[model samples]
Target chain A: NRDKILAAAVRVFSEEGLDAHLERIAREAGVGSGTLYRNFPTREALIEAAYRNEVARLCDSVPGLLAELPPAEALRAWTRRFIDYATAKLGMADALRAVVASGGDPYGDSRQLIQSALTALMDAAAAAGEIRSDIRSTDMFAALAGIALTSSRPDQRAQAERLLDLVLDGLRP
Target chain B: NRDKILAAAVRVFSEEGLDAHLERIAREAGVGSGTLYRNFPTREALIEAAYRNEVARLCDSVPGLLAELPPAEALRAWTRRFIDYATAKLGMADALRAVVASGGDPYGDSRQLIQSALTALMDAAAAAGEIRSDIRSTDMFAALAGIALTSSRPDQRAQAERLLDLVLDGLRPTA
Candidate 1:
């Protein structure tokens, strides 16, 4: 299935960097190389399509996280998931850079999707009086991204989480 | 005369880049190439020396700032100067990038210098009850640099100042 190919691609690319070949991807996915070409004609197409799929999957999970947990807890869980997302993206750094070099806005829709997700979590928390309503989701987005960028190293994740909690304190009323 | 050369190098390298020639710098400083070489032997040497001079000049003024002004007022003034300092240095981005490419540390002494400067400023303000005491000057420096990196742009000095004020406000007890 398409899902299997993409998932395998994620694993392979994360392990092998973005330069992993279609032949290897098909081999890992238990499919023929033709299947990959049939699904994604160009390298840019494959990388972009795979990246967007990950974003979509992550963004789509917001409601579920909020539905099953307290708003604050859900936001925290989602933020940790964001670390995985960022880490995975970091793994695909070369591929994405190539996408940009080839003249595509790989992050074009990412901001809106991320902002809406954070806005939903923030709005629910604000309504429950857990966080101040005056907090701007864009500001939170910028702050979180800054924190993530500064803590991109695997060893620094603990410090990154601590900083996250500090910013979370600021988010509260 | 060396001071004049250093000042002119800052202005030119900022507006131009490390690609600027010694002759160009000499003309800008109203000196000959020989005089320029007398002060800085090489292009990288000139940039590094000029940058250290500027940073030292700014950092050395911290005590003077604290001595003459109230804590809050001094912080405001120093922060304003810091903004100008970052902006002026940004103008030399090409030179810094070149340094990086050449395996140089444009920021080798920067962190220590900035940390000491922040310590002095924060201590003055904390003692006066203008800001919180528990916050590390290092973390505050991070936030300030983040603000400058993320938000500050051309002709946006006012906005940068306002953001600095907000970050300062975020450090207040009631905030």
Candidate 2:
């Protein structure tokens, strides 16, 4: 029930923003208003939890993806997935601005979560001899952020993919 | 007289940052304080002009580098040069803040100049079949800016070069 509400909150808040109705999220989660409030008592709380939930989901996917795909392929897919997460984050920038205005920090624990995920992905690929051993998660993180910074625009997706492919090629051992 | 002052402004600003005295720049240029003030009129003007001059110098080097080296080698050298430019620009950030604080725009005519330089370099490399044609200057601009963001730290220079080398390799045409 908690997972369902958090997922629904991410979807609704990302789609309709901070001004989005909590009842809509409750409906999306198939939970009652009382249950939703029990889980996340305030709009700010829900938004912060939802953002954190998305980060958790993104981080938790690394091992699962590596299990399902070859390490290098998994890393490639993960980079693309990171771009998606970045896009969603970009979408929530305005709602997040309101969180800040309300004195709520929407970014708590996000960077550490991302760093762990990158470290996991990079380590798996390196152990498998699929990528350069010297590649650092910090560098990859910076590169992905760079790609996101440029390619977050609707029209720049193709260019973003090209750049990602370029980075992936560079990662090859 | 104006050229000497601008040259000195570029050197002093790049070396001493935005807070470097105009009189020192005038001295470096071997011009009188009155001459420097008469030409620049304001410190903000001097700084802006100095930054633009640096940009012009960096951008203008693209052709000269290409003329002397292979496209790939030229791109490599230019990338190193860009780090230098970005480092100097970083130093100028505080002074530029003052420029903005004083209602003067410090970034005038900068982006277009950089875009043109990247376009020129990328086009030459692509035309020579040295790099992938799909690469865009806008994307490279972001990538370089990204590298500069993290790798600009004193400890990160080696990582910065490594990351840059990766991009350059990616730019190579596939078999």
Candidate 3:
């Protein structure tokens, strides 16, 4: 199934970077390379779809997190999850860079989707009077993206978490 | 004479977005065109010198700021000044891009210079117990740089200031 291939590709790509072979992904999905090729004819196509799939999965958690946790707590939990997303994105950076050089708008609507998801969480938190009411979703996105950009290395996790905490603390009412 | 030309270049370059003519800068500096050419030799040299001069001026202000005000206020003041620096750099972005295209390292030692400048301010603030002692210079730099990158538009100045305040508040001891 396409879903199986995408999920497998996400795991393999994250584990092995974007250089991981198509055959490995097919094997992980219990499908043949021909099927993988049929589903995604090019590596860029696969990386893009897998990335979008991850974004959707990540965004879809906002409502569930809000339902199960306090708004601020949910925001915090989701912020951590964003680091995971950022890390996966890092793995695919080279492929995406190549895509750009080849004249593709690989980013597409992903930023807008991210903004919507963050605004949902921030709006809920603000309405509850749990966080600063004036926080812009774009600012939140920039803060997190800033952290991920500056400190996503294996050795920089501590600094990254601290930066995230500081930014989240800034959001406190 | 060279100082006059460099200062005028900074002003004209900042205001006119890096494409302002050398003759205009020379006029502003009350110098001859030949004088400007004799000093800078090339547009790239003039732009690079102006940028480095600005960086040095910006970095040098940290100590005077700390001496004149409390550490946190000084940091706040310096951060605003950084917005000016970032804005000027944005104005020069096209010029810098061409510098890169021409195989020049336009950013030589600038990042290190900035990090050192920030470290001095953060260290002073932390030592005075005016801010959270555990704050890393790199983290503070990243946060402010984020604000500048994301919200440095003329209309976004208020939001940018608010973001800076929030970051400063996060550095305070918990209530």
Candidate 4:
């Protein structure tokens, strides 16, 4: 029920703006208003929950991606996924800024979590001789952060893929 | 005389601070106050002159480097030179801002000049099969701008070179 509600929350909140009502989220999730309120009593709580859920899903997807694809392909696929995640996170930027206005942290431990996922994927890719390994997780993180900052806009999607390919090619041995 | 004074203006203005007196600039250049004043007429004029001199030298280096080295090597060497130019330009950041505050533009025609230089270098590198040709000069400029921003501080210089090398490698033809 929580996962179902979170999925709805992210979609409706980001697409409709965070000011969209709880009843709207309930309707989107095919649940009753009481269920939405009982699961998350406040709008801020729902916002934070949705954000954390996205991070967890993104980080948690790496293992599954690695299982399904070769290490190099997995890393490539993950970066594309990262663009999608960055897009949503940026869309939620204003909402999260509001959460901060009320003293909430939606980014708690997100850096460590992102770096952990990067390490796993990078190590596997390096061991496979598919990508260079001399660079650190933090350096690559900065590289991706730079890419993410530039490619957040929807209109920049094609440019984002092009730049991401450039970076991916950069990692080759 | 003007070139000598402009060089002194950059060194004195960036190092000793723009607020440093005009006498300091004149003394540094080994020129008299009357000579400096007669040439530039104002402090902002001197600042703009020095900046234009730096840009002229930087952009004008391309033909010489291309004549001396392979196109690929020239581009590489030029990027390093660009780092030095960027470092100095950033150091002059505050002074330029003040120039702007007073409604002066120290950057007129600068973008066109820089793009022309980049076009020459990038085209030569691509023609030699040393780098990819599909990417535009503007794209490389943005990439370099990002690197410049992150590596402007003296301490981040080593990281700057490493990152620049990474980008250079990325531009390789997968050959």
Candidate 5:
């Protein structure tokens, strides 16, 4: 029940940003504010936990993506997925900026997790003759982050995709 | 007289940004306000002239840099110069953002100019066996700009230089 409430809170907060009402989230989760606060303690705790959960879900989906799709397609899909993750975070840029200003390290450990996933995808693709062997997964990771930083913003998905295609072409074998 | 005014504007605006007073600028240049306005016409024009002058100087020095140093070393030295230029511009970011909001493009022809210089440097360096030949000067230029954008800011110069070194290292044969 607590898990259900937390997940529900994440969805509501992520969709509505930090302005989400605790009462509405609690009602949607079939719980109360007391239960929510008991688990999260504060709004920052809630938002941080919610973001981490989403990141974990996004990162953990890589193997399932590779298992189902062709290696190259899997990588592309993961790239697009990461782009969405970045876009959604950008939508919440104000909230994230607040967290940043408050000295929160939201990106901690994210690189390692994403790097592992990228290595799996890149190594498979490289062995399959789809990507260059000289390129490190971290390079791809940096490129993706760099592209996201350049173009990821609210209503800027089209531009982001255009730049992503350019980068993909640059990265392609 | 225009040259005197432009140099003083760069000094004052480089110190106080777009908030610089025309009167103060004229005083710094040892000219009257009417003389300053006769040259630049407006604050935006002054900023633009100052910015373009720096860009022109940087671009014009490429030949000198090439003549004085090896291709790779010249490129590295210009990149260091670029860091200084970018650092000063960063202090004017707020003013530039305002300029953008007012439909002005402070970016100008700097990109193409710098890209050409970098291309020439990389081509010469490649021929001299100083760096990798596979990558284009344009790509290296993009990577350098990416490093500068990613790692720049006040008090972050040390970190930014380290990032520049990393990019340079990546361009070497070992990478």
Candidate 6:
């Protein structure tokens, strides 16, 4: 029930934003209101938990990506997925704030994990001779940070992808 | 006299930041304090004119760069020159404010001219088959803006160069 409720929160909040109704989430999850409240007593609690779930979903996605694709494709796929998560899931300005108000930081734990994910992706890609090993994971991070900084805050999704592809092109052997 | 004072203002402000003295600028320009004041009339005026001169210098360099270097190398050199201009000359936050306070905006005139300069450089590069003709100048501008945004605010000069080279590498032709 908890997991179901949190999943509902991700879709609901991502789609409807932080002001999304709790009852709507519970209905989407097919759970009783009492059961939803039993797991996450407040909207902020649900927001915080939902963001953590998204982070976990993002980090845990790496191995599956590697298994299904070559290292180069995996890195590209992961990059897009991350951009989506940042552009969509992290769009919850209110959701992130709500998480902070609830005494947990979803962003804090996600940072190291996200950097680690980059390391894994890049190292695998490098080991496969698909990319230059000299580039730091932080270099990738900085590129993404710059891309996210410029291409976001407006509907420049294609530009973000272009910038991402440009950055990836730099890593080519 | 105004030109001399303004030239001095650029060197002094670029080296000593916005707070460098007006008298020192006059001294650097080899002009008397009275003569400097006679031309610029105020420190803000000096700062404003100095910035305009720097912008003019930047815009005027494209022709000289193209004459001497290949399009690719010119683009690279111009890119570095711009980063230096921005990283150094544009560091005059207080000087910028002083210009504004003097009822002028040094930034306004520089924009179109700078964009025009980029257009000149990129079109030449593309015409020469040195870079992709399809890419927009604004794309280069956006990349530089992003590079300037991230790799600045501290001394990340090499990172800026790396990011720049990465961007330039993307414009290469393929099989």
Q: Which CAPRI category fits model 2?
A: incorrect
The TM-score measured for candidate 3 stands at 0.48
* Clashing pairs for predicted structure model 5, backbone only: none
The positional error of residue B30 in candidate 1, measured at the CA in angstroms, is 48
After TM-score superposition, what is the CA distance of residue A13 in candidate 3 from its true location, in Å? 44
Give all candidate RMSDs, comma-separated: 17.1, 17.8, 17.3, 19.3, 16.2, 19.8
| Residue B33 C-alpha lDDT in model 3 | 97
Question: lDDT of candidate 1 vs native?
Answer: 0.71
Tens-digit lDDT track of model 3 for B5-89: 7778777887776568889999998999998886666686677667766765666566467658888889889988887788778
Badly placed stretches (over 4 Å) of model 5 are A1-19, B1-175
lDDT per residue for candidate 4 within A1-173, as digits (tens), equals 66788888877777777687788889888899988876676787788778766765666566557668888899889888788878888877877888767645455445555665676678778867999978787777787788789987788899999998988888899
Candidate 1 chain A least-lDDT 10 residues? A103-112
lDDT of 2 by residue, B15-133 (tens): 77766988899998898899877656678767766665666566656655766888788888998888877877776777666655654444533565566567667766786798988
Better of 1 and 6 by lDDT: 6
What's model 6's lDDT at B32?
88
Local error of candidate 4 at B85, Å?
A: 52
lDDT of 3 by residue, A1-173 (tens): 66688788877876776577889999988999988876676776677667766665666566567768888989999998888888777867776776566543344345655665677678768867999989788889999999989987667888988999999999988
Residue B83, model 2: lDDT of: 80
Candidate DockQ scores, in order = 0.01, 0.01, 0.01, 0.01, 0.01, 0.01
Position A172, candidate 6: lDDT:
97
For candidate 4, write residues B61-150 as lDDT tens digits. 665677688888998898887777676777777787775565455654445455556766787788679999887877777777778889
lDDT of 6: 0.71
Cα lDDT of model 6 by residue, A1-173, tens digit: 55577778877887787689899889988998888876666676577667656655555566557667888899999998778667755567667776556443344224555666677678778978999989998779878877877776447898999999999999999
Runs of candidate 3 with Cα error greater than 4 angstroms are: A1-173
> Which is superior by TM-score, 2 or 5?
2
Q: In model 1, which regions exceed 4 Å deviation?
A: B1-175
